[PDB]
Amino acid sequence: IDQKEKELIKESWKRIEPNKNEIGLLFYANLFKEEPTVSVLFQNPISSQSRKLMQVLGILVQGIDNLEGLIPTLQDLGRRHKQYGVVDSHYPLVGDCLLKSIQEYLGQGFTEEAKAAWTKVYGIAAQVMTA
């Protein structure tokens, strides 16, 4: 993750953040449509789950200049995900759905370059969570 990618993440978060409630919920609607077998894993209210997911994305943006500082947080999260029935092959599916949902909601407000940067950041977060 180079300086340019870090900037694109900070810059695009300024448009994601004000829209984060909708983006998170759109993500879950899209996920449950696209991957009908993962919805059974979610046991708590989706409204609160969406808030939790977007909160963590904001933490990734806040720590984007030093992600290594987030390895422990992410390792704990990955551990809980195993307890939720999540498996390694879920991560690419969730990543694609999240990025596509941001793209859908923001349209021309979200560049291909920003999409690529978020893809790398997601890939990193997922690698840390799956060890």
What is the spatial distance between Cα 88 and Cα 67, in angstroms, rounded to a whole number?
21
Map the footprint of ligand HEM across residues 59-118, applying CB under 6 A. Answer: 77, 80-81, 84, 86, 90-91, 94
User: Phi-psi region for residue 40, left (φ > 0), alpha (ψ -120 to 50) or beta?
Assistant: alpha
Q: Which of 32, 34, 38, 67 binds ligand HEM (CB under 6 A)?
A: 38
Nearest alpha carbon to residue 63 among 21, 2, 9, 107:
9
Residue 33: CB minimum distance to ligand HEM, A: 11
The residue ranges that bind a copy of itself (CB under 8 A) are 21-22, 25-26, 28-30, 32-33, 36-37, 39-40, 42, 45-47, 50, 104-105
